[PDB]
Amino acid sequence: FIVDVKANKHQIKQAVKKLYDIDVAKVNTLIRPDGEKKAYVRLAPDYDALDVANKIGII
Amino acid sequence: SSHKTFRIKRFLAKKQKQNRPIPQWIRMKTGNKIRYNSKRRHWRRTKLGL
Amino acid sequence: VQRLTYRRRLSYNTASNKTRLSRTPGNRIVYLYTKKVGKAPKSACGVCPGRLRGVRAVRPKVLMRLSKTQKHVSRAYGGSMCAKCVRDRIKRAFLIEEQKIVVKVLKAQAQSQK
RNA sequence: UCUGGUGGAGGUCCGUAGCGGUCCUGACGUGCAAAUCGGUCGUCCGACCUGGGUAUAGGGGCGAAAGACUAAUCGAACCA
RNA sequence: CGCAGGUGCAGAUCUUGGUGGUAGUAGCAAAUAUUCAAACGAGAACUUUGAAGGCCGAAGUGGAGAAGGGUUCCAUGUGAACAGCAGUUGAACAUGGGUCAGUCGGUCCUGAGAGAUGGGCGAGUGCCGUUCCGAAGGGACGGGCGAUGGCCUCCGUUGCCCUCGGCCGAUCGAAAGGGAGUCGGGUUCAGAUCCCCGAAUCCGGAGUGGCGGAGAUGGGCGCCGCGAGGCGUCCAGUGCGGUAACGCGACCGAUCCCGGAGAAGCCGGCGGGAGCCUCGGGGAGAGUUCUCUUUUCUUUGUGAAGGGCAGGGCGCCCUGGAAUGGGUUCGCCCCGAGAGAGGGGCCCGUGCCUUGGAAAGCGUCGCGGUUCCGGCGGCGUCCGGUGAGCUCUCGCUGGCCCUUGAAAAUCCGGGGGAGAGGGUGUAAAUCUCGCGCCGGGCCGUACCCAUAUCCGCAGCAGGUCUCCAAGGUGAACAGCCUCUGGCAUGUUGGAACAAUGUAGGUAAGGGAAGUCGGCAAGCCGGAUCCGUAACUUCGGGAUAAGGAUUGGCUCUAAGGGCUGGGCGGCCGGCGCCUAGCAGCCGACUUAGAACUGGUGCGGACCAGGGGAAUCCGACUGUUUAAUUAAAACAAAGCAUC
RNA sequence: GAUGAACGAGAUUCCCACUGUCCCUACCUACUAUCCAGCGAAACCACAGCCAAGGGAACGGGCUUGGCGGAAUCAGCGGG
RNA sequence: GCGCCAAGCGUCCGUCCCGGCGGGCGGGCGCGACCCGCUCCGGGGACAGUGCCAGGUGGGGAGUUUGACCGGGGCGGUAC
RNA sequence: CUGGGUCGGGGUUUCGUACGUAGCAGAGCAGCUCCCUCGCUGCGAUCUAUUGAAAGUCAGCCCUCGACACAAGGGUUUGU
RNA sequence: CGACUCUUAGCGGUGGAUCACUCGGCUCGUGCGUCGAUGAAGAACGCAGCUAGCUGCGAGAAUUAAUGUGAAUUGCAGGACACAUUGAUCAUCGACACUUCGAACGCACUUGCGGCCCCGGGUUCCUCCCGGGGCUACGCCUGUCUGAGCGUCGCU
């Protein structure tokens, strides 16, 4: 995801859980040279990333 | 260097995003006078104020 | 011969950049960053040049995750004073107190007889 | 007292890296370079060389002292 | 017709812009070097692939970082402009993409220093000042006095009062100082100790005890029980072992006090460990085979964290009492303040084995599906020897100093004993022991790191802080050649070989006659064996000066380590190692000799010409960056104020 | 002030050795210069550019009087 | 060597217990550790010092000047 | 009445006896042997013969004429 | 003959003078004459479907609401507005909103570290973890509370 720069991993994990109804294992954070924050959100083993991506519409 | 502060990185981010060419449809706007981006900056030629 | 590179961004041979050579299961030689050598406690007496016995020579902050037996010797002034000077203070305390009783008795007897 | 060993001192000698810069009054001299290049040279455990961080600001600083250096500017810098 | 001016240019080394001749001229000459073929393509001296020939030659033209740069990184496309020839190419242009951390840093601590408040000064913005002219504590064992909430008999949270209490003062200051804790394998076009797999670890929290273990479960009097073993009563129990050094899995405890660690220079010499190099064999693959070579080349693992064992060290302990002094080091050094001898203890353990672990990695030989399956399978990943070898590191022990070579956060140990716990339960307070549960937020992270990503106006022979560092020759990190890795000769090519030049050589006979002057060049040069003067501050001068040798080959002599001493043992007189004998193992040199070459041999490379004097400065050191390196300055010493 | 071992990229004289410093120059090598394809400057410039004498601001390319003078160029050169 | 956070006395309590006094349990105060006296202790002192004026010294510092004529200027002369 | 090239021959000339083979030459050394010393074998710089041999020689040397292919082709101009 | 050189004219070009124009200046004059701890000026970073700069804006970001107006905006696209079951655009602007620095305000200038009181979620009054909200700067005035003083006194 691309997230707000003023957002830590706790806020990112809670948000992804709230609007997508999924469980998060861990979150990794990066700030790109563009200036925006990139979050790598690994999901729990029960949830499938491809199925979640289909429901969101990114694939 | 790799070791940089957040303030410097955000400053370099902005200069990176504003180093783009003029869009093509701007030339078609009524009463247009811009032909190219005259503020293009090359890293080797001109150095940043920082 | 394979040549090595630093695994960290410190490029200087400082006291906190010391390394050793280790051979990996991948048959490669890599740097391993080593901890500083600890020192055992020095005796509180101030006259013994050697370190104390029975106490691990580790860096001070690691000392708090060891058990108490690794940090002391089973004796009065165990992990802070050597045995030799503990012995000397037992005798020094006893003999000076003995002299004080003798002096007090001698001055009391002299006062009574004079 | 002499001899043979051992020992490893020194602002010690030859001499690398490093630091410097003698002579050719060599090269270049609208240069590679608003001071560089080659051979040859001085020193190379010490008054040694060096990074970063700190302090001293213009009639002031700093000077193993050449009026030297103080951002290609110094017998008082630069800016307005 | 009147009115009013910023009203007339050839000049001013005039100002701004534009343009000529020079001139298709100067130039595109620092660091050895390119060639053949093919591919893509309109187009190739310059791109890519392959094959040759060369270079950097590990103090690299290699692999990585710090500053600085800021997207230059990566893929695709273009060939307008730029990259001083081209270009199918680029650090150019365009379109997309790329930097993932509790355990790598920042963040925290103080250093040199910077800097508020109090105070003082100051017309004033403000300045001095950092403990100095301040009532500078806002916290806490604990106790009491009240409210409140709960798994509410009781405990906990919150206000007030006693008790304690020096901040020896805010705060800032290091991406090289201090500072707990992560390492193997795989994965990308570009990320990675950060992602995946695996195995660990530190810190914090757990109240309503998470489970165990410890504390901690004995003794006396009796009674019953055949007796064991149970019933009543009474008294213990904040652990235990070793003579000791100290040890064991825990092993209560506050204010207060003492101490330790963090936390220390430079140089030398020895020793231990590892990595690298080396030597002898065994595998697997490859090269050569015109002749030989059982050959030559490559490769031949086990992370952290635990457990055990070597090994290293010790001013640690016990017995004991030494001169006919002994022990002992390369050097030293040690002993009645306790040597030698014997027996223990501790610390470190980066080494070996082991869990991790072979399931993974690598080598090699095959079999599959399809672009990727960490596909599948077989075999292997072995046994030794050396050393003043190089590097790193751990130790021990010395030398030098009118030089003595940080601080603070942070962590620990001890002294004391204010307190707490329970009356004999299967118990309490308590536990730095074993396992179990939860969390670790913010920022940096791509790439260049320089004869093309930094500064010098640029792809500028300049400048710019570090880390790793193979073979041969040899004193060597010297120079010369080579391997791993890298490159395309440094902003162009073709042809020719004139003058003058820049750089490198040679020269008959003289031998400084040249010139201000031996400037420049040349002579000498290494090592071994001889031999060395005047003078002198006795240290030196000194490689003084002068002479001889030096190759190749074949031998000789000397210089060491281990083991043993009359099927398997052993109760034994019966043996005697004693001019140190036998066997086995091993590396590096030194000296001497014979032979031998067209007298050539430190055969390249590396590599002091010397002597007799005068002047100045004692010496080492320093100086005008960019014309003066000197006799100038400094200096120890002397003297004065 | 005088002296003085050791030292000195300090100034000087002589001697041995050695030599292209010289008599007296020559030959060889690499890179240039040269010519070509491609690229492509700058300084400088009143107009320009053959001499002798004269006079002249007393040393002329220009003026006077003589000598004379023939497109366009190349490589060198240092009198002007 | 160790040394603090009172032992010991003398009294006063309990809304506390067990037989007005006693015992137990938990507390308080005084002495131990004297009283009084106006500046914490000590050293100077109407001096030093500060503010204002006056005299001296003051190239440490500031600003400025350092004639003219002249067979070039200077020196010399004065024909100023 | 051929020609000039390219190879190849031969002459000239430079250096100084090539590789291989053989040796009863070679300072010496090791092994077998008999069971212990005749011989044989091997290592070994170098030496002797083959061998004034081998190698180079116009590219700006001399004569060939033996082999091989090639040489009547191309472009631009010039008139009393 | 040419070539070369010189001059003139025509035409063509390295060039951008002259003329004409001007949503710009300069000068004079008139009326107003208003910033900020309720956070100013000035910085920083962001915000458009395609948008770099200028401009406008602030997480509601090239704008929301309201009023007036009355059919557009426009470079392309898309869909509003049926053009009264009341509204495109523009103007005005009194409502709402207004990120981070900055006098700049919890301490410090690094996306560093706190404290007190509340709210929600994990566990349940560990306030242990995460998220959110309100406070937490200096000087100074009136009042308030709590205090100090061998300062002056009174009752004891």
PDB file of N, CA, C and O (backbone and C1' of nucleotides) in Angstrom, chain I residues 23-51:
ATOM      1  P     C I  23      -2.487  46.984 -23.824  1.00  0.00           P
ATOM      2  O5'   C I  23      -2.193  46.659 -22.296  1.00  0.00           O
ATOM      3  C5'   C I  23      -3.055  47.127 -21.267  1.00  0.00           C
ATOM      4  C4'   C I  23      -3.110  46.167 -20.105  1.00  0.00           C
ATOM      5  C3'   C I  23      -1.777  45.536 -19.712  1.00  0.00           C
ATOM      6  O3'   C I  23      -1.742  45.346 -18.300  1.00  0.00           O
ATOM      7  C1'   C I  23      -3.314  43.841 -20.299  1.00  0.00           C
ATOM      8  P     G I  24      -1.033  46.431 -17.355  1.00  0.00           P
ATOM      9  O5'   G I  24       0.492  46.393 -17.798  1.00  0.00           O
ATOM     10  C5'   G I  24       1.386  45.443 -17.249  1.00  0.00           C
ATOM     11  C4'   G I  24       2.809  45.921 -17.344  1.00  0.00           C
ATOM     12  C3'   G I  24       3.190  47.055 -16.410  1.00  0.00           C
ATOM     13  O3'   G I  24       3.497  46.610 -15.103  1.00  0.00           O
ATOM     14  C1'   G I  24       3.949  47.545 -18.585  1.00  0.00           C
ATOM     15  P     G I  25       3.308  47.593 -13.852  1.00  0.00           P
ATOM     16  O5'   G I  25       4.189  48.866 -14.219  1.00  0.00           O
ATOM     17  C5'   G I  25       5.380  49.149 -13.506  1.00  0.00           C
ATOM     18  C4'   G I  25       6.358  49.941 -14.333  1.00  0.00           C
ATOM     19  C3'   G I  25       6.676  51.332 -13.820  1.00  0.00           C
ATOM     20  O3'   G I  25       7.639  51.309 -12.782  1.00  0.00           O
ATOM     21  C1'   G I  25       6.303  51.399 -16.159  1.00  0.00           C
ATOM     22  P     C I  26       7.352  52.033 -11.381  1.00  0.00           P
ATOM     23  O5'   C I  26       7.668  53.557 -11.673  1.00  0.00           O
ATOM     24  C5'   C I  26       8.918  53.949 -12.208  1.00  0.00           C
ATOM     25  C4'   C I  26       8.816  55.306 -12.839  1.00  0.00           C
ATOM     26  C3'   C I  26       8.110  56.359 -12.006  1.00  0.00           C
ATOM     27  O3'   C I  26       8.950  56.934 -11.022  1.00  0.00           O
ATOM     28  C1'   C I  26       7.278  56.412 -14.208  1.00  0.00           C
ATOM     29  P     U I  27       8.330  57.423  -9.629  1.00  0.00           P
ATOM     30  O5'   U I  27       7.553  58.755 -10.010  1.00  0.00           O
ATOM     31  C5'   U I  27       8.240  59.860 -10.568  1.00  0.00           C
ATOM     32  C4'   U I  27       7.283  60.912 -11.057  1.00  0.00           C
ATOM     33  C3'   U I  27       6.178  61.304 -10.093  1.00  0.00           C
ATOM     34  O3'   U I  27       6.605  62.188  -9.075  1.00  0.00           O
ATOM     35  C1'   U I  27       5.252  60.952 -12.224  1.00  0.00           C
ATOM     36  P     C I  28       5.826  62.229  -7.673  1.00  0.00           P
ATOM     37  O5'   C I  28       4.500  63.035  -8.004  1.00  0.00           O
ATOM     38  C5'   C I  28       4.564  64.352  -8.526  1.00  0.00           C
ATOM     39  C4'   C I  28       3.223  64.810  -9.034  1.00  0.00           C
ATOM     40  C3'   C I  28       2.071  64.705  -8.053  1.00  0.00           C
ATOM     41  O3'   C I  28       2.051  65.740  -7.089  1.00  0.00           O
ATOM     42  C1'   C I  28       1.391  63.836 -10.125  1.00  0.00           C
ATOM     43  P     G I  29       1.578  65.422  -5.589  1.00  0.00           P
ATOM     44  O5'   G I  29       0.005  65.235  -5.714  1.00  0.00           O
ATOM     45  C5'   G I  29      -0.812  66.295  -6.178  1.00  0.00           C
ATOM     46  C4'   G I  29      -2.199  65.832  -6.543  1.00  0.00           C
ATOM     47  C3'   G I  29      -2.985  65.111  -5.466  1.00  0.00           C
ATOM     48  O3'   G I  29      -3.524  65.968  -4.479  1.00  0.00           O
ATOM     49  C1'   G I  29      -3.226  63.962  -7.502  1.00  0.00           C
ATOM     50  P     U I  30      -3.767  65.408  -2.996  1.00  0.00           P
ATOM     51  O5'   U I  30      -5.138  64.607  -3.106  1.00  0.00           O
ATOM     52  C5'   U I  30      -6.321  65.241  -3.565  1.00  0.00           C
ATOM     53  C4'   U I  30      -7.440  64.255  -3.773  1.00  0.00           C
ATOM     54  C3'   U I  30      -7.800  63.386  -2.582  1.00  0.00           C
ATOM     55  O3'   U I  30      -8.593  64.053  -1.619  1.00  0.00           O
ATOM     56  C1'   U I  30      -7.663  62.040  -4.508  1.00  0.00           C
ATOM     57  P     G I  31      -8.339  63.786  -0.058  1.00  0.00           P
ATOM     58  O5'   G I  31      -9.226  62.509   0.261  1.00  0.00           O
ATOM     59  C5'   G I  31     -10.563  62.420  -0.199  1.00  0.00           C
ATOM     60  C4'   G I  31     -11.051  60.999  -0.169  1.00  0.00           C
ATOM     61  C3'   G I  31     -10.791  60.244   1.121  1.00  0.00           C
ATOM     62  O3'   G I  31     -11.739  60.545   2.129  1.00  0.00           O
ATOM     63  C1'   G I  31     -10.185  58.897  -0.721  1.00  0.00           C
ATOM     64  P     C I  32     -11.403  60.240   3.667  1.00  0.00           P
ATOM     65  O5'   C I  32     -11.833  58.720   3.846  1.00  0.00           O
ATOM     66  C5'   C I  32     -11.213  57.903   4.822  1.00  0.00           C
ATOM     67  C4'   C I  32     -10.923  56.528   4.285  1.00  0.00           C
ATOM     68  C3'   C I  32     -10.081  55.641   5.185  1.00  0.00           C
ATOM     69  O3'   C I  32     -10.840  55.016   6.204  1.00  0.00           O
ATOM     70  C1'   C I  32      -9.259  55.538   2.969  1.00  0.00           C
ATOM     71  P     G I  33     -10.553  55.359   7.743  1.00  0.00           P
ATOM     72  O5'   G I  33      -9.081  54.809   7.992  1.00  0.00           O
ATOM     73  C5'   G I  33      -8.758  53.447   7.762  1.00  0.00           C
ATOM     74  C4'   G I  33      -7.309  53.282   7.380  1.00  0.00           C
ATOM     75  C3'   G I  33      -6.277  53.643   8.440  1.00  0.00           C
ATOM     76  O3'   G I  33      -6.018  52.580   9.345  1.00  0.00           O
ATOM     77  C1'   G I  33      -5.673  54.600   6.351  1.00  0.00           C
ATOM     78  P     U I  34      -6.993  52.258  10.580  1.00  0.00           P
ATOM     79  O5'   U I  34      -7.717  50.911  10.139  1.00  0.00           O
ATOM     80  C5'   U I  34      -8.121  49.943  11.099  1.00  0.00           C
ATOM     81  C4'   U I  34      -7.694  48.550  10.709  1.00  0.00           C
ATOM     82  C3'   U I  34      -6.198  48.258  10.833  1.00  0.00           C
ATOM     83  O3'   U I  34      -6.013  46.902  11.228  1.00  0.00           O
ATOM     84  C1'   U I  34      -6.883  47.894   8.611  1.00  0.00           C
ATOM     85  P     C I  35      -4.857  46.515  12.266  1.00  0.00           P
ATOM     86  O5'   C I  35      -4.740  44.937  12.135  1.00  0.00           O
ATOM     87  C5'   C I  35      -4.764  44.316  10.860  1.00  0.00           C
ATOM     88  C4'   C I  35      -3.711  43.246  10.743  1.00  0.00           C
ATOM     89  C3'   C I  35      -3.554  42.334  11.941  1.00  0.00           C
ATOM     90  O3'   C I  35      -4.550  41.337  12.037  1.00  0.00           O
ATOM     91  C1'   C I  35      -1.427  43.023  11.222  1.00  0.00           C
ATOM     92  P     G I  36      -5.190  40.999  13.467  1.00  0.00           P
ATOM     93  O5'   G I  36      -4.022  40.252  14.248  1.00  0.00           O
ATOM     94  C5'   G I  36      -3.506  39.019  13.775  1.00  0.00           C
ATOM     95  C4'   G I  36      -2.323  38.553  14.583  1.00  0.00           C
ATOM     96  C3'   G I  36      -2.509  38.481  16.086  1.00  0.00           C
ATOM     97  O3'   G I  36      -3.232  37.341  16.510  1.00  0.00           O
ATOM     98  C1'   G I  36      -0.446  39.505  15.610  1.00  0.00           C
ATOM     99  P     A I  37      -4.090  37.390  17.864  1.00  0.00           P
ATOM    100  O5'   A I  37      -3.765  36.011  18.576  1.00  0.00           O
ATOM    101  C5'   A I  37      -2.455  35.737  19.049  1.00  0.00           C
ATOM    102  C4'   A I  37      -2.434  34.566  19.995  1.00  0.00           C
ATOM    103  C3'   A I  37      -2.935  34.866  21.401  1.00  0.00           C
ATOM    104  O3'   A I  37      -3.525  33.689  21.948  1.00  0.00           O
ATOM    105  C1'   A I  37      -0.665  34.223  21.494  1.00  0.00           C
ATOM    106  P     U I  38      -5.121  33.531  22.015  1.00  0.00           P
ATOM    107  O5'   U I  38      -5.538  33.144  20.531  1.00  0.00           O
ATOM    108  C5'   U I  38      -6.354  32.007  20.274  1.00  0.00           C
ATOM    109  C4'   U I  38      -7.262  32.218  19.087  1.00  0.00           C
ATOM    110  C3'   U I  38      -6.727  33.150  18.005  1.00  0.00           C
ATOM    111  O3'   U I  38      -7.196  32.704  16.734  1.00  0.00           O
ATOM    112  C1'   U I  38      -8.765  33.993  18.822  1.00  0.00           C
ATOM    113  P     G I  39      -6.191  32.007  15.697  1.00  0.00           P
ATOM    114  O5'   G I  39      -4.786  32.649  16.047  1.00  0.00           O
ATOM    115  C5'   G I  39      -4.409  33.914  15.523  1.00  0.00           C
ATOM    116  C4'   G I  39      -2.916  34.022  15.418  1.00  0.00           C
ATOM    117  C3'   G I  39      -2.289  33.016  14.452  1.00  0.00           C
ATOM    118  O3'   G I  39      -1.300  33.607  13.611  1.00  0.00           O
ATOM    119  C1'   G I  39      -1.355  32.765  16.639  1.00  0.00           C
ATOM    120  P     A I  40      -1.231  33.151  12.068  1.00  0.00           P
ATOM    121  O5'   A I  40      -0.955  34.496  11.275  1.00  0.00           O
ATOM    122  C5'   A I  40      -1.870  35.574  11.325  1.00  0.00           C
ATOM    123  C4'   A I  40      -1.136  36.883  11.267  1.00  0.00           C
ATOM    124  C3'   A I  40      -0.038  36.967  10.223  1.00  0.00           C
ATOM    125  O3'   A I  40      -0.542  37.306   8.942  1.00  0.00           O
ATOM    126  C1'   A I  40       0.762  37.774  12.300  1.00  0.00           C
ATOM    127  P     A I  41      -0.057  36.511   7.637  1.00  0.00           P
ATOM    128  O5'   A I  41       1.342  37.170   7.284  1.00  0.00           O
ATOM    129  C5'   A I  41       1.423  38.536   6.921  1.00  0.00           C
ATOM    130  C4'   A I  41       2.824  39.055   7.070  1.00  0.00           C
ATOM    131  C3'   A I  41       3.894  38.291   6.311  1.00  0.00           C
ATOM    132  O3'   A I  41       3.973  38.666   4.946  1.00  0.00           O
ATOM    133  C1'   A I  41       4.616  38.682   8.529  1.00  0.00           C
ATOM    134  P     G I  42       3.959  37.558   3.784  1.00  0.00           P
ATOM    135  O5'   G I  42       5.336  36.787   3.966  1.00  0.00           O
ATOM    136  C5'   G I  42       6.563  37.493   4.036  1.00  0.00           C
ATOM    137  C4'   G I  42       7.643  36.634   4.628  1.00  0.00           C
ATOM    138  C3'   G I  42       7.778  35.259   4.012  1.00  0.00           C
ATOM    139  O3'   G I  42       8.490  35.278   2.792  1.00  0.00           O
ATOM    140  C1'   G I  42       7.797  35.065   6.361  1.00  0.00           C
ATOM    141  P     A I  43       8.449  33.996   1.836  1.00  0.00           P
ATOM    142  O5'   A I  43       9.588  33.067   2.431  1.00  0.00           O
ATOM    143  C5'   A I  43       9.609  31.689   2.135  1.00  0.00           C
ATOM    144  C4'   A I  43      10.133  30.886   3.290  1.00  0.00           C
ATOM    145  C3'   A I  43       9.923  29.393   3.165  1.00  0.00           C
ATOM    146  O3'   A I  43      10.891  28.783   2.340  1.00  0.00           O
ATOM    147  C1'   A I  43       9.242  30.088   5.303  1.00  0.00           C
ATOM    148  P     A I  44      10.412  27.976   1.048  1.00  0.00           P
ATOM    149  O5'   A I  44      10.162  26.519   1.620  1.00  0.00           O
ATOM    150  C5'   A I  44      11.025  25.993   2.612  1.00  0.00           C
ATOM    151  C4'   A I  44      10.382  24.844   3.334  1.00  0.00           C
ATOM    152  C3'   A I  44       9.579  23.898   2.466  1.00  0.00           C
ATOM    153  O3'   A I  44      10.390  22.980   1.763  1.00  0.00           O
ATOM    154  C1'   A I  44       8.358  24.411   4.414  1.00  0.00           C
ATOM    155  P     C I  45       9.996  22.549   0.273  1.00  0.00           P
ATOM    156  O5'   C I  45       8.867  21.453   0.490  1.00  0.00           O
ATOM    157  C5'   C I  45       9.082  20.361   1.366  1.00  0.00           C
ATOM    158  C4'   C I  45       7.783  19.752   1.823  1.00  0.00           C
ATOM    159  C3'   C I  45       6.790  19.403   0.736  1.00  0.00           C
ATOM    160  O3'   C I  45       7.118  18.211   0.053  1.00  0.00           O
ATOM    161  C1'   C I  45       5.664  20.480   2.502  1.00  0.00           C
ATOM    162  P     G I  46       6.339  17.817  -1.289  1.00  0.00           P
ATOM    163  O5'   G I  46       5.066  17.032  -0.756  1.00  0.00           O
ATOM    164  C5'   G I  46       3.886  16.963  -1.531  1.00  0.00           C
ATOM    165  C4'   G I  46       2.655  17.173  -0.692  1.00  0.00           C
ATOM    166  C3'   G I  46       1.373  17.364  -1.480  1.00  0.00           C
ATOM    167  O3'   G I  46       0.806  16.134  -1.877  1.00  0.00           O
ATOM    168  C1'   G I  46       1.535  19.035   0.181  1.00  0.00           C
ATOM    169  P     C I  47       0.471  15.873  -3.419  1.00  0.00           P
ATOM    170  O5'   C I  47      -0.980  16.491  -3.582  1.00  0.00           O
ATOM    171  C5'   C I  47      -1.991  16.208  -2.630  1.00  0.00           C
ATOM    172  C4'   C I  47      -3.157  17.143  -2.787  1.00  0.00           C
ATOM    173  C3'   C I  47      -3.534  17.482  -4.216  1.00  0.00           C
ATOM    174  O3'   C I  47      -4.303  16.473  -4.841  1.00  0.00           O
ATOM    175  C1'   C I  47      -3.463  19.459  -2.940  1.00  0.00           C
ATOM    176  P     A I  48      -4.122  16.180  -6.406  1.00  0.00           P
ATOM    177  O5'   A I  48      -4.909  17.367  -7.111  1.00  0.00           O
ATOM    178  C5'   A I  48      -6.283  17.604  -6.826  1.00  0.00           C
ATOM    179  C4'   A I  48      -7.052  17.943  -8.075  1.00  0.00           C
ATOM    180  C3'   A I  48      -7.009  16.874  -9.163  1.00  0.00           C
ATOM    181  O3'   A I  48      -8.264  16.814  -9.832  1.00  0.00           O
ATOM    182  C1'   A I  48      -6.105  18.900  -9.997  1.00  0.00           C
ATOM    183  P     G I  49      -9.142  15.474  -9.750  1.00  0.00           P
ATOM    184  O5'   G I  49      -8.439  14.497 -10.785  1.00  0.00           O
ATOM    185  C5'   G I  49      -8.444  13.093 -10.594  1.00  0.00           C
ATOM    186  C4'   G I  49      -8.102  12.382 -11.876  1.00  0.00           C
ATOM    187  C3'   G I  49      -6.873  12.905 -12.602  1.00  0.00           C
ATOM    188  O3'   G I  49      -5.671  12.353 -12.098  1.00  0.00           O
ATOM    189  C1'   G I  49      -8.665  12.719 -14.126  1.00  0.00           C
ATOM    190  P     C I  50      -4.310  13.205 -12.106  1.00  0.00           P
ATOM    191  O5'   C I  50      -3.951  13.341 -13.649  1.00  0.00           O
ATOM    192  C5'   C I  50      -3.440  12.233 -14.371  1.00  0.00           C
ATOM    193  C4'   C I  50      -3.416  12.491 -15.855  1.00  0.00           C
ATOM    194  C3'   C I  50      -2.483  13.586 -16.342  1.00  0.00           C
ATOM    195  O3'   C I  50      -1.129  13.166 -16.408  1.00  0.00           O
ATOM    196  C1'   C I  50      -4.581  13.802 -17.406  1.00  0.00           C
ATOM    197  P     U I  51       0.053  14.212 -16.724  1.00  0.00           P
ATOM    198  O5'   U I  51      -0.400  15.563 -16.014  1.00  0.00           O
ATOM    199  C5'   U I  51       0.221  16.003 -14.814  1.00  0.00           C
ATOM    200  C4'   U I  51       0.386  17.504 -14.785  1.00  0.00           C
ATOM    201  C3'   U I  51       0.600  18.124 -13.411  1.00  0.00           C
ATOM    202  O3'   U I  51       1.976  18.154 -13.075  1.00  0.00           O
ATOM    203  C1'   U I  51      -0.941  19.416 -14.731  1.00  0.00           C
TER     204        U I  51
END
